[PDB]
């Protein structure tokens, strides 16, 4: 007993109170490996998690063999053991693997205890917050901490990640918001596909802004009313503020702004016809950003 062990007994008492989970589960949440030792006349955590009930008379244990987590690989009985223990399918198993480690170029992973512990940590992160693997990934991306890997992380960083996830989940529950809605509002990648709504926006802006003079008035102020009309806004100045924000953000793979958008519409846009334009995908991304 020392500073280190006494530091996380408080953490496990917190997790067992907050999440009402068992002691061993809270220890897993405390970045602790699954315990092979069985005491108190009870089967061990590893045995309870994987070995029971025995699958086709095969006993699962840590080994030097390599197990594939690729969903389409149709792995051996060990992959089935992992799926049964985690109560997830192959695709979500691969998604959990990608969530846990960003250094795993291929789906194959080592069958040692550390990788299993990392996978269990990732699974329990979603279990405690009443989310499955998909919302866990989308949440971690929406947070911005999804870039960091759970496999190589500090204990204090893991605790901070737990607190951030709990706070955001509580906020979403208070706001009656789905995780997908938050991901959409916080998304940066934009679909580059023309839509009738986007086409109507382009037609209205091109017709309204035709004959515009740069020195006579600000381009953004002139363009705001048509954007408000097309994008279903109550007020014009809301569209003006959104356009200012978009110009500061420079949306899309080709950084788009009001001047560039107006020039593209003036030169390379022909309303009323379906044609392929190299910059058209960037235009679509900018329109999607405005709507977002």
């Amino acid at each position: 007993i020392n500073t280190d062990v006494l530091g996380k007994v408080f953490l496990t008492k917190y997790y067992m109170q907050r999440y009402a989970i068992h002691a061993e589960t809270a220890l897993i949440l405390c970045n602790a490996p699954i315990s092979q030792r069985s005491y108190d006349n009870q089967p061990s955590q590893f045995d309870r998690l994987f070995n029971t009930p025995l699958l086709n008379g095969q006993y699962f244990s840590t080994g030097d063999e390599e197990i594939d987590l690729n969903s389409g690989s149709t792995g051996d009985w060990r992959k089935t053991i992992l799926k049964r223990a985690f109560n997830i399918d192959d695709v979500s198993l691969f998604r959990l693997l990608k969530i846990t480690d960003h250094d795993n170029k291929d789906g194959k992973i080592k069958n040692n205890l550390k990788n299993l512990s990392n996978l269990y940590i990732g699974k329990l992160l979603a279990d405690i917050h009443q989310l499955t693997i998909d919302e866990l990934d989308l949440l971690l991306i929406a947070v911005g901490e999804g870039k960091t890997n759970l496999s190589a992380i500090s204990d204090k960083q893991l605790a901070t990640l737990i607190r951030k996830l709990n706070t955001i989940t509580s906020w979403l529950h208070t706001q009656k918001w789905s995780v997908f809605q938050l991901f959409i509002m916080t998304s940066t990648s934009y679909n580059k596909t023309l839509t009738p709504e986007i086409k109507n926006l382009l037609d209205t802006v091109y017709h309204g802004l035709q004959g515009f003079d740069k020195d006579k008035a600000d381009l953004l102020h002139v363009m705001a009313p048509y954007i408000a009309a097309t994008l279903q806004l109550s007020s014009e100045n809301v569209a003006h503020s959104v356009l200012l924000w978009a110009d500061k953000l420079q949306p899309g793979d080709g950084a788009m702004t009001a001047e560039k958008f107006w020039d593209w519409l003036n030169t390379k846009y022909t309303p009323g016809s379906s044609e392929a334009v190299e910059t058209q995908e960037h235009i679509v991304q900018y329109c999607q950003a405005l709507a977002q």
Partner: protein, 49 residues
Amino acid sequence: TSLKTQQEQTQSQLAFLQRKFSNQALYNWLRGRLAAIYFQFYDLAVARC
């Protein structure tokens, strides 16, 4: 069964609200286009005055 039917009737009426011509989107476009015309016509009117 009656309450489940009412859920469908509320969805059908909501769908009719969004799908009709003279939905929200037509009036938003009408407001924006007319407001732009109104201000442009205002400058000409005051210049004539």
